[PDB]
Amino acid sequence: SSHKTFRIKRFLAKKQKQNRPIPQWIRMKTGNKIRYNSKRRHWRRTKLGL
Amino acid sequence: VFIVDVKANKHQIKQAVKKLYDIDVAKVNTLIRPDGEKKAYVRLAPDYDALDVANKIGII
Amino acid sequence: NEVVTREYTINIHKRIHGVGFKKRAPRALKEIRKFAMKEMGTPDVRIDTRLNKAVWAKGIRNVPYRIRVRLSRKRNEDEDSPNKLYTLVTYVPVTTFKNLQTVNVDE
Amino acid sequence: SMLRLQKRLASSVLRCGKKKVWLDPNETNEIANANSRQQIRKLIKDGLIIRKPVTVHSRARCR
Amino acid sequence: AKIKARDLRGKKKEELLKQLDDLKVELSQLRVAKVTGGAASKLSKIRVVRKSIARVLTVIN
Amino acid sequence: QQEQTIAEDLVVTKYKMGGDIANRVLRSLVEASSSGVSVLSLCEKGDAMIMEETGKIFKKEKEMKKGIAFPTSISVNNCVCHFSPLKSDQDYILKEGDLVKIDLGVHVDGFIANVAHTFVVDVAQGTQVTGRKADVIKAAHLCAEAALRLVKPGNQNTQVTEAWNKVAHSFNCTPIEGMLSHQLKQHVIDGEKTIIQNPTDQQKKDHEKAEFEVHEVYAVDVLVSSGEGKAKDAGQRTTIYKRDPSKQYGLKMKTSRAFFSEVERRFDAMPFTLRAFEKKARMGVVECAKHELLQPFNVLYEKEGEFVAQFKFTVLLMPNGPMRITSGPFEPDLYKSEMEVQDAELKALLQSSA
Amino acid sequence: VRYSLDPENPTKSCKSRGSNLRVHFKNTRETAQAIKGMHIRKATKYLKDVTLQKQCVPFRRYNGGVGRCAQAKQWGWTQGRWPKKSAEFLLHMLKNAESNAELKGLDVDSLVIEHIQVNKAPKMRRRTYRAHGRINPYMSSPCHIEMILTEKE
RNA sequence: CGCCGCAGGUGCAGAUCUUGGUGGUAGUAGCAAAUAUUCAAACGAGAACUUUGAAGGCCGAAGUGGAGAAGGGUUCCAUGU
Ligand SMILES: [K+]
Ligand SMILES: [Mg+2]
Ligand SMILES: [Mg+2]
Ligand SMILES: [Mg+2]
Ligand SMILES: [Mg+2]
Ligand SMILES: [Mg+2]
Ligand SMILES: [Mg+2]
Ligand SMILES: [Mg+2]
Ligand SMILES: [Mg+2]
Ligand SMILES: [Mg+2]
Ligand SMILES: [Mg+2]
Ligand SMILES: [Mg+2]
Ligand SMILES: [Mg+2]
């Protein structure tokens, strides 16, 4: 909602920063074995815990 | 416009800008961004210009 | 010639008879387009917006029985198109349809 | 090309609905260049954007 | 031109605090340059100044 | 269809005027620079003469825009080019024995005469300049003679690059990677026809192949370092911008809008410097260049202690032999090298004057 | 790459190929069988006529529920349709094959489709929602298509 | 891997067996609740569906309008794909 506590807003802030694509240079690293961010979350498919 | 520490209040922002930029400020407006960082709108005193201060700060 | 323009009257009533209420006006413009392709032999038929108003003047189901149109076959020599000829059909307002023939109209 | 933004801004500037905003169908390119409310105001002054009049609902029959 | 821990230990509190202040104003300038594009040379100096600040502070402590 | 080429004698005469005026400004500058001077003063002076002389010339026509086609640019022992500091920036004081690179351009009726020359300051009478730097300037001037001789319809743009690489390797140096010369036409300084200097795979695959044509101007540029040929930036302000007339964006700030209008009024499409304004210019330029309204010309730095040279001059291409309109004061008596040309074809092209 | 049925001599032959194409395999297989053995000019008109519904492709194997048409009598059949998307995809591949033929410098007025093959491509998954809180597959059926054109006249 | 001994979590068609994969069904059922679309133009490789204009309709202020609480958490806004 519009009325939110600081903890809830701070919690939403962290979930927002970590929902980004992996940097491209990562695949160039030796022994990368990572293709894409498997922890991507869309607001409509899956809802946050809180 | 500055990005400040989330624990700093308006009084602390006012003193911080005053000493390390040698300017006088009129008021400080504060919000916390959706990314979690705190943003401060620091309005300078009328006798100070925000354009040359930004020029010597280096954010032109 | 091939840049000929002619003026016709189309029996919309005949060509719309039997069509449902919500489809009479949309079908009237399809029959008008079909009519133009037949007499002018051009697949590309452009219908003037004023003619589109006249067909839709009395709503979607009470289409006018008769409409007086003017078929202008013109060159498409303006861009690379599969058709070098196109027909522009326009609206000709009339007060009566009695004794109205198909007439060749000059420039 | 696409003028969804311009019709929204013209509606806000003219203080009318998007029903009454008229964008010149011939001068689409100039309107497409307007990305600011100031640019929309200049286009309104220049006649490329017009507030259409209210649809007539007469009371003569009732009177 | 870097600062080491060994040569910091002979200094007294006044210039150690002076040394720390000069590094802090330089790091803040580097952070300004990071936001306004800056250069790769200035971006790579952010870590160098940060560890220099840590180096001065640990000697004071 | 309405473009103006060299088919007209008036075009010919005002090209000659641009060449003469650029030559006289550079001749004044090479003498005026001495030990203990300031590059800010040099840049201000170089613009100051050009303004008055272009104003007094064509006094009977006050409808055409004429003046600076490229701002005065100084590069001294550590900078490549596009260097022109403002008053607020820390100035550079000329020491003894520095080699400096001068770039300056003039325009008449939108047509460009743009010249760059490297020379050493404060040369004593009877002395010889000796060192590793003594070969790079001489190789650049040999590139100048090579380009002058070989610029001709039918000679490909991929031949001048290999000739310059060949002479650079003959002098055991290399040019800076990825520098572009251009074909210069009316109100254009960044023409589609591009010549490339010391390319690599990416620039070669992005480069075009073309055949030299009649009735056109080239700005052939040699720009050679004595180290590795690589350059970057050292966190210094960019001072040269040019308005791109292709793309447009609606500027939402009054300062940027006024700055852009002033740029259109004075330096409509030609490169300028932020010195020509300052307080509000430095703020307007960031919003203008964010949306690619102004192409920047960044300062490029070589490694510390390296030496880099440059020559460049507008050459017209006429059917019976190209001519040079802007020339720099380089003398072989006061400047020699410890190594010469070991290529027979290079000797053949350098010994043949145009 | 490995084609099935290499040409009798790969000097008067050109090849074209596509993988994971978003056309129904069943419609494309029937359309490929119709143009097999055709001259390249005949196949191009025929595929254009299918788009205009002036000529049909007979549905011989994957014919369940396929309706009857008058144009199916040109073929010795009764059931036919006008797969527009299959016609476009084969038209694009025929253009690619003809361009390959020009690259090898063999004339394109004598090309004949001697080999054409439609293969199943890996299915792609979507979802559909059913009556009592049930999820059902909504699979796509893409196809790999290859063809070989040879000169004969 | 053969031979002499030794030791087993040692042999599958089934168990409405477990996990995975694939068919016929089948180009089938179906994409039918709430009246409705049409003409011209633009961009574009490509237009029934995008945008603009014109026309015909609908919601009809107990709205298919304008704003909030709870809940969602960036879905908001530009540009691009
Ligand atoms: K049928
Ligand atoms: Mg939900
Ligand atoms: Mg607050
Ligand atoms: Mg069946
Ligand atoms: Mg369902
Ligand atoms: Mg359910
Ligand atoms: Mg067992
Ligand atoms: Mg089994
Ligand atoms: Mg069905
Ligand atoms: Mg149905
Ligand atoms: Mg109603
Ligand atoms: Mg509402
Ligand atoms: Mg949105």
Side-chain angles (χ1 to χ4, degrees), chain E residues 39 41-42, chain F residues 233-235:
Chain E
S41 57
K42 278 174 184 316
Chain F
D233 63 344

Side-chain angles (χ1 to χ4, degrees), chain F residues 282-315:
Chain F
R282 269 179 69 222
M283 184 176 177
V285 69
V286 304
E287 167 62 22
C288 292
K290 187 51 165 188
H291 299 272
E292 292 187 0
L293 269 62
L294 317 173
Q295 306 182 335
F297 290 107
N298 317 282
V299 286
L300 274 299
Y301 275 179
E302 65 263 17
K303 323 302 153 197
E304 271 54 49
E306 277 294 329
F307 297 83
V308 61
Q310 192 180 7
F311 291 124
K312 188 199 88 205
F313 45 97
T314 51
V315 189

Side-chain angles (χ1 to χ4, degrees), chain C residues 6-44:
Chain C
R6 265 192 294 281
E7 155 177 338
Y8 299 90
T9 183
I10 306 171
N11 197 321
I12 300 301
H13 195 201
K14 178 174 92 163
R15 294 172 175 74
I16 302 310
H17 177 274
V19 177
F21 277 167
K22 295 306 211 207
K23 295 200 158 188
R24 288 171 81 79
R27 154 73 51 97
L29 279 148
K30 283 180 164 184
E31 304 284 322
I32 282 172
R33 187 174 327 253
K34 259 171 51 48
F35 180 95
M37 299 175 53
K38 184 173 189 61
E39 277 79 5
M40 286 300 180
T42 56
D44 185 6

Side-chain angles (χ1 to χ4, degrees), chain B residues 51-52 54-56 58 60, chain F residues 237 279-280 282-283 286:
Chain B
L51 184 47
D52 63 359
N55 272 340
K56 73 174 54 171
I60 196 56
Chain F
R237 197 178 309 283
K279 203 59 62 156
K280 289 182 185 290
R282 269 179 69 222
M283 184 176 177
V286 304

Side-chain angles (χ1 to χ4, degrees), chain F residues 206-322:
Chain F
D206 289 6
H207 206 252
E208 286 291 333
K209 188 46 162 36
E211 182 260 336
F212 285 14
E213 272 283 350
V214 291
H215 314 109
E216 66 184 5
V217 176
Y218 279 169
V220 285
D221 208 332
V222 53
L223 188 146
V224 282
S225 62
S226 188
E228 196 178 2
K230 319 299 186 312
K232 52 197 167 198
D233 63 344
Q236 191 183 2
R237 197 178 309 283
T238 290
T239 50
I240 311 304
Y241 300 87
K242 70 160 305 295
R243 204 279 303 271
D244 192 356
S246 175
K247 55 185 73 66
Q248 175 184 358
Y249 174 76
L251 298 184
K252 322 202 175 208
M253 297 179 194
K254 195 144 174 186
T255 66
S256 306
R257 214 173 310 123
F259 163 77
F260 191 85
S261 292
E262 182 138 0
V263 164
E264 195 274 331
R265 271 189 333 266
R266 300 174 56 171
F267 302 101
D268 52 350
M270 302 305 109
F272 59 89
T273 176
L274 292 202
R275 263 198 298 101
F277 297 84
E278 192 271 332
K279 203 59 62 156
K280 289 182 185 290
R282 269 179 69 222
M283 184 176 177
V285 69
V286 304
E287 167 62 22
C288 292
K290 187 51 165 188
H291 299 272
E292 292 187 0
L293 269 62
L294 317 173
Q295 306 182 335
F297 290 107
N298 317 282
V299 286
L300 274 299
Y301 275 179
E302 65 263 17
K303 323 302 153 197
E304 271 54 49
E306 277 294 329
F307 297 83
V308 61
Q310 192 180 7
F311 291 124
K312 188 199 88 205
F313 45 97
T314 51
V315 189
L316 196 158
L317 199 54
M318 76 181 287
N320 48 289

